[PDB]
Amino acid sequence: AAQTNAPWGLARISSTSPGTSTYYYDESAGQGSCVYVIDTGIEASHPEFEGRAQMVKTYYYSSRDGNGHGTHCAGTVGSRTYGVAKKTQLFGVKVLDDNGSGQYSTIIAGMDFVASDKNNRNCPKGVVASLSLGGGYSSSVNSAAARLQSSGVMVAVAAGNNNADARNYSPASEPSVCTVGASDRYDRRSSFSNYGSVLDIFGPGTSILSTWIGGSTRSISGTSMATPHVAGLAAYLMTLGKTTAASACRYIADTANKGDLSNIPFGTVNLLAYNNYQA
Template sequence: MEEVIFGKKNSRRFLLEKNRQLLVVRSQAGRKLDETLRCEKARQALANSELVLHIEDADVQLFKLPDNSDIPQCKALLRELPDVRFAGSALVDPHTQEPVFYTENIFLKFVDRLAPTECLVILDELGLTIKQQVPYATNAFFVHHAHCRGTEVCSFTLQLLERQDVDYCHPEILRPGQRRAIHDNQWHLKKTTVTYQAQVDASANVEAAHVLAQGEGIVIAIIDDAFDIDHPEFAGTGKIIGAKNFDRLNARQGPRPKNPLERHGTAAAGVACANGEAGASGVAPRASLMPLKLTKPLGARAEADAFFWAADQGADIISCSWGPPEGHWADPTDARHSQAFPLAASTRLAIEYAATKGRQGKGCVIFFGAGNGNESVDNDGYASHPMVIAVGACNDQNRRSAYSDYGKALWCCFPSGDQPHPDPKFKPATSIPQTRGIRTTDLSGRFADPINAAYTELFSGTSSACPGAAGVAALVLGVNPALDREQVRHLLADCCDKISHADDGPLGQYDQNGHSHYYGHGRLNALRAVQLALERGKTAD
């Protein structure tokens, strides 16, 4: 059993155990693992094994070996290959048995009182080589120890964390993430009859807000899998700002998708700020888009770099429709429902940098989709961070979407698609969705769907709710850019409509502070949000 502490030395310890049937193989730097494993020795070692996961950017592959495998022999054969850097048992979460990858990179932050030269002297004494001095925290580095191999990195970082001059120290732990979508029209923007004859009055009142504001002058950074920045809804001078690809292997292609599976970011960006000139309007159609492509696993140092980049390049708002793996929303026995997911210190510090230093000190407004597991958002270290606004989903019948996460950290909700709920307490009239999902942008060009080219009506989940809420914040800042992050946060709470349903039970009720575990402070009302922003601007004058 290995232990990792993502916080300070007295913080919770997270346990990881080896799974002997799961084999991790990593290539030497600059070598392609696919090519390395084409030889006869590799085929012999991996005979009848199943490729479970391939993290392309890090060139790591995870295999499940057959039950009758000679596991030591498999490892020995692979280790004989000159281009294989590591071949060993995978670490897994003991609660869910999900794989957890680790690199030999270490995140290390010294206490703030040390001078930069003192940090360098200590690093040299410890035999640590600097891979990156991070810009979002004082005295913080990603480092490497030449003689610390495999799982030794876990115990080594715990030893370093005991030092009085160290604030944080943990291995770079990578976990597969999950986009905040459910399955594969603009009813979320206004009261309307959609094309298949369903009358829907469950919007965030966005069309009415557009009379007063459309997000002019505001930059929304969206961190996601890829972006079709050539889409007509993202055309125009100044629409795309600060685009960057944080995937090392494909950085030159920018944030564009490299295959038709990378379509999630395009849909999320459309919900936030599509121009609305051809087939779909975003909540803030005149806001600029900062598309930041990030497909690395959760916890990678590039994740923190993306938040720093967004703040440093002038983003006002940051929207993230992704997070930890979740339990199945309709299966209450799924063990992942109760899994606590920690936030790497590097990512935490980068989020806090953006939230306090962004916008010339007024702070970037940061949104995360609450999640689609029908479970507590409070276990999600990303969405529950106190400087983050966690957004839930509500459906076309003015109640919580069946999959949407809930809890103390949930701040608000925004209209999105839904799923029929199997629980009998959900009456048919209020449990069967009347709409297919949210209409937004989809891939155009060579990856376009031949039937529904460039648009989709099937976007859903808190993946759609999150950029919708980010768009409302853009409307607010567009009319009152003097508001700081906390003022925007509280304004969004004040503007909400208190939706609920009789079947919700105690979790759907609002407390004396106007908060509900199911709805946060309620469903965002964009018109009311803009009106409040204008009123508070006059008061400040």
């Protein structure tokens, strides 16, 4: 299939070269997969989700995304226009309050919830979690991400926006999950993107257009924006039978665009998420 005039990140993840505007993807589109967006929530009513999004858990007085961040990332995972995996099921897990912050304990609880909640859901193609959040290093936060991954969920987390080594951040520094750096539309590492050996993969992260609350749209930058690209790509590749939850991160790394990014410090992978789609 082809989405013309797609946001630059969707185009990028289906192209070997920057600057294109068409998103090429297999029509299966992640149908049969599920992606938990662990974030400020999801405005499930946004038309762009075509009813494929729902709130499943909140850690605050409301399930409403009163911030936008989580609606934005769900949109990049799976909205009709802004989404990588345009037929996936989205489940919202509100671990961040409307100011976008959440205690470590709450984020850990949210991941343990997904590990269990997926057994109540129909996801024949597999289960992804997209974690656009982070804080300082935390062994317990890391372990939570590792459990979620162990439980059979492809976990993707943001490297963090500190222009620093991601080893000092969690869950970015958990080895067993897919830690995602940000690139911009000129195939430069995003100026804010963390880096380091713990990074597994880069995705579009700078000026990413997606859904916003109020049924609106906006463009935001952050590794938190690159993360849902990789999660949607995993859900897409899982639906296509090309990889599994346990292997999707490595599979995406293996099949990535290699060496195309600039300002990747030595010791950090130079790999850009790519769907290798062929009409």
